[PDB]
Amino acid sequence: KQYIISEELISEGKWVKLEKTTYMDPTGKTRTWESVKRTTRKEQTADGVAVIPVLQRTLHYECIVLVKQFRPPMGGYCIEFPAGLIDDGETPEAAALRELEEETGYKGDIAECSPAVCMDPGLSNCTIHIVTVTINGDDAENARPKPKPGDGEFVEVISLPKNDLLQRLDALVAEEHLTVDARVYSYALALKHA
Amino acid sequence: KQYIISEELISEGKWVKLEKTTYMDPTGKTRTWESVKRTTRKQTADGVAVIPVLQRTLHYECIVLVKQFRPPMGGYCIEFPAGLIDDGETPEAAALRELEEETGYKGDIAECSPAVCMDPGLSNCTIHIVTVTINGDDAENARPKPKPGDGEFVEVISLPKNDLLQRLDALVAEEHLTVDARVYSYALALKHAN
């Protein structure tokens, strides 16, 4: 029953824009909302990808590979899944593998790719694919991995056991006063709850 | 070593503002970033999202989710019940209140996350994720009564925990809904456990 009537540009930057969204509610009344969008989205199925990288090695507990970076909107450092925007013409899977190698030095193998999922749907239209990748840590390719960070990219790699993820994240928040990503926290909670 | 130097207001709506952040990169260079902030924050965080685990004897455990029209998405989304924390409210009380308004269920706090970031490349928005158990066999949860706000139109969807990821993938394939990325990450971790 609900649908968009109009989207009116309020302010556009190089990377993000704010819109006044007019939509029809299910009782037939017109209402408005203030919506954010990225300017960068072309024909990609999503703005970006986030990679769940399961590092697998013989005689080691599986690890979730995460990254720590300064995030200017947050005014501080955040722990997140490796992530980036999808390049024009790039598949989600290629972008996930590429971002994982750039951010961490690891070469992974695709396991699964989600449909487009929304990041904060009361605020923005931004979507990602969440791509699960295994890393064969016994392979020499993955022995002493070199990250290839881009222009103005400064990322630290943090590998935590899957079997103790939530507790190890709670420990980091207690020792370093950094922020954990909501998707990473949701994943760590479900690992506990199962 | 990285820090915020200044924040220039680009555009302020009633609910959302766009800002241009100047910050010092670690190579001593000044850089800028376009960021979104909500105009409603005071709190520990902008909001809460509730992970409600409906427990009913002789039944599978269910994760209780909501479906709504999200104007920024231009479509219907499936999400954890959620909202902004009122001034003076605690995360835990906002969790139980939102859960009751959106679904009718009266639950019990099990755990509460630190403030976690929603999309830290884009915004400063944060939430507490609050795990709540619902005793579906109590008489108060027999005929759950939602208390939705003016303009709020929320449909409750309870899905089994032990197949969640498969059930979501289906809702997407056969109802063209977008699943929230927190919900999805939770679902993936339930499969990825053990």
Ligand SMILES: O=C(O)c1ccccc1OC(F)(F)F
């Ligand atoms: O959008 C609708 O048609 C609708 C109408 C009345 C109540 C709930 C509704 O559904 C949903 F928005 F999903 F919660």
Ligand SMILES: [Cl-]
């Ligand atoms: Cl639980």
Ligand SMILES: [Mg+2]
């Ligand atoms: Mg990135």
Ligand SMILES: [Mg+2]
């Ligand atoms: Mg990057």
Ligand SMILES: [Mg+2]
């Ligand atoms: Mg809500």
Ligand SMILES: [Mg+2]
């Ligand atoms: Mg609400």
